[model samples]
Target: MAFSELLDLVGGLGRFQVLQTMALMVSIMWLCTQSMLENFSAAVPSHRCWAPLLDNSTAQASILGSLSPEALLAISIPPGPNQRPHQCRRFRQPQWQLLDPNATATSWSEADTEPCVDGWVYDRSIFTSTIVAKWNLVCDSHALKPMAQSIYLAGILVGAAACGPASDRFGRRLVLTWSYLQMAVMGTAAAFAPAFPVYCLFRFLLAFAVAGVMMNTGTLLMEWTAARARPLVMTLNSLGFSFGHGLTAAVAYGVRDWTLLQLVVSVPFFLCFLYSWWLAESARWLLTTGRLDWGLQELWRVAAINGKGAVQDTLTPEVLLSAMREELSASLGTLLRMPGLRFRTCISTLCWFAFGFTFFGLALDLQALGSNIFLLQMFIGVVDIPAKMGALLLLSHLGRRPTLAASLLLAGLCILANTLVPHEMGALRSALAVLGLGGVGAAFTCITIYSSELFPTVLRMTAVGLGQMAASGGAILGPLVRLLGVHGPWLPLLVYGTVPVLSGLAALLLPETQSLPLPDTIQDVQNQAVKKA
Candidate 1:
């Protein structure tokens, strides 16, 4: 309680805070870009099985101008569902007669075909190279491409579980710095991965570090910001994520090569690592953890930066001790042990899980519209801004609970509604999809802010970590649920749409924290419960 007042004296929402927050904003932006990088870097281009009989330029490009292109392809490839060349199978022997206008199609259909044993010839117009192309992740091995993404999500899940406690134990600054370095090294290492397994490994490690950066950056931002301006500042940080999401398109468009794109996104982290040392540790964390001496110096340093040097001089060690009249400690068990905390944790985690499930489900599905992938990516990214803006407004005026619930409900309804649109009505369906994604984006922004406001400082990172792990779990599940569409076209949509509505209902149970100063201890959170009762 006194710490909030202490924060005011030290200029909590002043120039220093702005600079510190903007420094972190860069990392969050790049973190997002890296997360979405695989959409291009691992893109599976249109491919067909190679036919050695027609392949004169075996060691080079598919030189169609050298001969009759359609004639050669007709003999070597079998027509699939869309009457296009089959991607996975090729004729055992070239059926040269199929090229004749009067040839019996029925006889050609009976010709022997086999799996693409020679190699796949990729349509390299969009992506000159991708992990899918470079490593030949098609046909039998096609499943591995998605598996790689799931593995990355798994790494993030592990990171959320591991880094939360580690950050709480070792301090946010140390963990954040190490995460920056790890991300730089691992992300760059992934660019030159020799095999699919190696690529997956590097991506996994990179994802782990990405989780660290996301959680710690959020924790650091909330821990340092004043309640009066927290929403605006946090919204701005999310905007960075959206900006980076859109920027990925421009970067990918310029560097058609996946490896170069990987490097372009990754190498900047080295700079982030270098500058990260300049970041101050969370002084609140220091005082709460009983490192008052270091905390005092850190505060004075901030005060100096905020141009409160004279005021800092008047602030003595004893003053900090008195300011931190709210001292207590916490652990992972503390979250579940407290009855009120336990309920909030469960509900928040459930909501986050739903968020991840619905958002990514819609996100990947929207990408399926598939034309000018860069433009689509940009559109998806751009929509997040207005959605987040609306969320910020709702969160500020309407409060956290209503904003979160309404957003989720809106998302679910939009998705469900989209399912009813006629397949012929592409325009209507796309409109609904855009709206649904916007709802998802709004809900996502709301949750990020709401989660930080819910917990106490000692357990903030850990609790948020729990929420993030749930989200990752949901992200993992989101894709798997889509597989159900094979059984019935509506099955996956039904699940995706319904979960968010249920989660929104669950969110109604959470306490509002709009104007509330962050709770400093478990005792403080308990006191709030008692007061609410």
Candidate 2:
């Protein structure tokens, strides 16, 4: 409370706070593209088996040039949808008869076809280069794409686990500064990676730093912000993250080459890394850890920036120490030790898992929607604005429990509905997918705040950390779930849409936190749970 008072004295939510928050929000905005990078960087463009005759440099160039490209493809590859060439198969010998405009569909369908023994040729109209094209990650090697994303998510899990304690031990600024530098170096390294495995390794490192950047940036913002303004600021940060999907679309639209696109997103972090050195360390962290002198100096610096320099004369270390006293748990056992904490932990963690799983599953598969990838990406980012804006109102008026439950239920139904829609209705399917993503976006907003509220201060971090781990665990599986498509076309959607509906039902079982004071101790949580029961 005293620190809260100190915040007021230093012009809480003043020019300094606004500027710093905006800067951090911009970082949050750009960093999110890394998560969605695979959507473009590895996008599987329309491809077919590479035929020798199609190779301009081959001895048949003059002969190949004599025939139209379509004629060449007709003689070499089997037809797919819309009578286009098959993506994975070609005739053992060119079917010269099929080149005739009078050729029937049945004629080529009977031709002997085999997998591309020679490499595949990708449609460079959409993407000049992608991982799919560079390494032919289609046909037999298709699983590698999702596997690589899962590996990156595994690194995100590690980073979330490691960085929390690391930030607590070191300082927020130090952890965040190092994260920015790591992202700059590792992400750039990823761009220039020579092999798929090496690229995955660098991506894992990049994901680790990405998690670090997100956690610390939010923490620093929260620690510095006044209570009255915390929600608005946090929503802004989340919105910044959402808008990053659109940013990915914009940058990727201009730079189609995977290598250059990868580099484009990474190079800006160097600027972030350089400027991060100037950002102030969390003053609350310093004071609580018994570094009153440093904390006081930092507060003095903030005061001066906010035009409260007069406080420097009166705000001594002793006075600062009295005002700055405040608020850790890192154990799953403690979180599960009691009834209320146990119930909250299980329920909220499941909700977190569903949110993470469904969001990534949908976000990463935008290319499969059969629409303009860039336009879909932009719509994803744009839709979140209204969804979140409505969520804010619902959170304020309807309450957290209902808001989360409704959002999840709505998103799940939206996705499941898509499964029933005809695949040919591309626009309707895209709209449903976008709306479902928006609903998950709203639920994501709720869970972050609601999870913290659900636990007591004594075990908050432990509970939150566990929830994040579940989230990361689910996220790691999201891409892999797409691989289930082989069994049935609807299997992935069924899984994605079902998990959240069940989790939303679980949300109903939890106690409502709205209009209630936060649990400051385990006893407080237990008593609240008892009263509800």
Q: Pairs clashing in candidate 1?
A: none
Off by over 4 Å in 1: 57-67, 109-111, 325-331, 364-370
Candidate 1 has its poorest 10 consecutive residues by lDDT at 58-67
Tens digits of lDDT, candidate 2, 59-145: 366463477777777887888878777777888887888877786867755448877887887889989999878878887888888
Tens digit per residue, CA lDDT, model 1, 1-533: 35677788888878878987898888888898898899889889999988775664672254433447777787789887688988887899878778778876667544488778889899998889999999898888899988998999999999998899999899999999999999999888899888888888889988899989998888888878888888888988888888888888889999999999999999999999898888888888898878989888888888888888888667788766765654542467889987888999999899899889888667644755778888988998898799899899988899999999999999889888877777776767677788888888888888988988898888888899999999999999987887877998788889998999999999999997876657877777887888789
Candidate 2: residue 414 Cα off by (Å): 3.0
Cα lDDT for residue 207, candidate 1 = 88
lDDT (0 to 1) per candidate: 0.85, 0.80
